[PDB]
Write a protein that binds this ligand. Structure first.
Ligand SMILES: Cc1cc2nc3c(=O)[nH]c(=O)nc-3n(C[C@H](O)[C@H](O)[C@H](O)COP(=O)(O)O)c2cc1C
Ligand SMILES: Cc1cc2nc3c(=O)[nH]c(=O)nc-3n(C[C@H](O)[C@H](O)[C@H](O)COP(=O)(O)O)c2cc1C
Lengths: 362, 362
């Protein structure tokens, strides 16, 4: 029935944050989210960025695994071109086992050429999408634990035969229940190749909210690819990422956003980038304004899901009418490490008072 | 000063233990060792083994990081041929940062062909594992330095990018704590150890598995000669030596707890048949004047293992020190006491607080 609440931890940590502080904020976020019934926590991967400063989401997932009871974790995404697929497959399976299946897997190519370069991919010639395909092909076969060898374009890998007593046969690091984890992919462009791939393979679709047109287009491409490949598209699997903040009143919610960590990140970091690459055009069209006038207050008033629980509940209901809805509201985590209380109260309000009222039509 | 106490967590988990139980035991082990002043915890890496069932020691280190105050962690060892070196270098630096330098790095080739095969290396003991170790380390040290390069190697492509042409837009810094390579360790097992020679040449930390008096002395001979020849001053206090060690109130109950507990079980079921098949108890047999064919559990408990009361163990260590010159860290092998850890925890407290402080290094 009800739309779930999720957390996406990019993260967006203020420049100057230490690794220990970031890791601490991640574990506290996992524990708090689990405590208020948030369904899932996605954790991103970057080796070359300042704000998005987690190069190994699996370390955080592992650190929070036995400190949580119900929440599911997902790297979003492991960048398949950057790792040996056998090493990655084994880790994925083992971590899935540790979590007793409270796990799913995000895969991706990587959008940052500086980081592609570090991992030996120049002019991001090798093809990152082909690397993704070959890695996944390999990992799926390692999880099956049937012998094979593969001399690939990008990697060599295999699964060995047993040597000629339980203690002497091969380890079993297949994911929980002995099968592949549920796999997810994120889409950003309007006509998303990733959405197409996901429908084709029956993967979990993940969108970053960039306007009504793009959201509709993502589900259009995904469902048609799915039905064509013989799958039944399920809206409840669709996760959509939003900037969301809740407080007792609209006035306090807007103020806390405008004056705190969220407004600070947008003003200092995200807006200049989004403006330079015209990424607020979908927002501008939706609201009828000119992209040149897309500022923090415009976003807070027309884009972000900000207000009292009632105001936020209404805004989500509106989007649902316009789009058809989605399965998980994936709340973007911001740097409240120094001021946890209003952020935790906000998440608690979303998970317990907002999301349960939002019902899926499909 | 005093000889330090260390823990080595291979692990040796009874066949049938789940990934969750293994992970839980590792974290509980790290916390308890920290609480009784154990200096370091080494965690091994295997993808194909049953008893030694941790394919990603860094996950356990990360999970124990914020739960401990003083203990230092090391993967022992990361198998360099199995990972992209840029991905591995980045993880090592970030984890070193999270731990605020309570970290050091074991590297190795890998001694299990079934696991080598998984990672694309056929006919392991064609690609050369030691050459793979060299190229990986060459790359990782340059990534930690954060100076631009690109390397087109025999086994990997990797590099470090130039900054693009505001702090928030500069490259991330995932260099290890203090901006320098971590201290690097290698383990030796064979009599005339190439690993001991390499460690000497490069001023790495030597780690030996105790296999008899002659090998222990040969290890230090090979290491020191390589060290002096390369122009370093060999330091015995950096030498770590792994022993099977159990302490109790009296010699009688210490022996009984070993014979009748997890340690005796692992040795009887798993280790002894292997060691006997590959003549690995010949050094022990030579030492005690018996024939290898007569090496069984009780022989090991009586003449090899460091077992008894605090005084008996202290005297046994002194005899070894007089015979070999000694070592800096007594690396205690962790066994599967997850079901009933009280006598194991007490033993570790006795070793760390009552035994080791009395052993000084000449
Ligand atoms: C604001 C923003 C956030 C993003 N977050 C993620 C993320 O969390 N995980 C991820 O794998 N990719 C992320 N991306 C990159 C896109 O998901 C990537 O381009 C996509 O996988 C490929 O898009 P397409 O196939 O729709 O062209 C993000 C991009 C933007 C602009
Ligand atoms: C009982 C036993 C325990 C071992 N434990 C470890 C270990 O904890 N870490 C490791 O890197 N290698 C371990 N090894 C493998 C040896 O370290 C390996 O032979 C060595 O790295 C290469 O030795 P050499 O260069 O002297 O031939 C172990 C081997 C045996 C037989």
């Amino acid at each position: 029935m009800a739309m779930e609440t999720g957390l996406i931890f990019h993260p967006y940590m203020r420049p100057g944050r230490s690794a220990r502080q970031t890791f601490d904020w991640g574990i506290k976020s996992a524990v708090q989210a689990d405590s208020v019934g948030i369904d899932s926590m996605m954790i991103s991967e970057h080796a070359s960025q300042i704000w998005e400063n987690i190069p190994n989401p699996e370390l955080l997932i592992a650190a929070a695994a036995l400190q949580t009871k119900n929440i599911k974790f997902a790297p979003m995404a492991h960048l398949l071109p950057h790792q040996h697929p056998a090493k990655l497959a084994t880790m994925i399976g083992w971590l899935s086992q540790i979590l007793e299946g409270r796990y799913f897997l995000g895969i991706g190519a990587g959008a940052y050429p500086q980081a592609s370069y570090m991992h030996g991919i120049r002019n991001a010639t090798k093809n990152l999408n082909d690397m993704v395909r070959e890695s996944l092909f390999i990992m799926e076969k390692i999880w099956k634990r049937e012998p094979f060898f593969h001399e690939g374009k990008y990697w060599d890998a295999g699964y060995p035969e047993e040597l000629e007593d339980e203690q002497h046969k091969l380890a079993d690091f297949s994911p929980w229940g002995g099968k592949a984890p549920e796999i997810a992919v994120t889409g950003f462009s309007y006509n998303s190749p990733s959405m197409r791939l996901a429908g084709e393979r029956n993967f979990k679709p993940v969108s970053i909210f960039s306007g009504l047109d793009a959201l509709k287009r993502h589900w259009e491409v995904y469902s048609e690819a799915a039905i064509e490949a013989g799958h039944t598209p399920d809206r409840s699997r669709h996760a959509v990422s939003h900037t969301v903040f809740c407080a007792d009143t609209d006035k306090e919610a807007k103020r806390l956003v405008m004056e705190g960590p969220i407004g600070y990140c947008f003003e200092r970091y995200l807006i200049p980038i989004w403006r330079r690459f015209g990424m607020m055009d979908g927002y501008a069209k939706d609201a009828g304004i000119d992209p040149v006038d897309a500022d923090l207050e415009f976003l807070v008033d027309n884009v972000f899901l900000v207000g009292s629980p009632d105001t936020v509940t209404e805004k989500i209901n509106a989007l649902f009418e316009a789009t058809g809805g989605w399965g998980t509201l994936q709340v973007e985590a911001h740097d409240y490490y120094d001021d946890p209380a209003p952020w935790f109260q906000s998440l608690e309000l979303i998970s317990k008072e907002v999301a349960p009222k939002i019902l899926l039509p499909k």
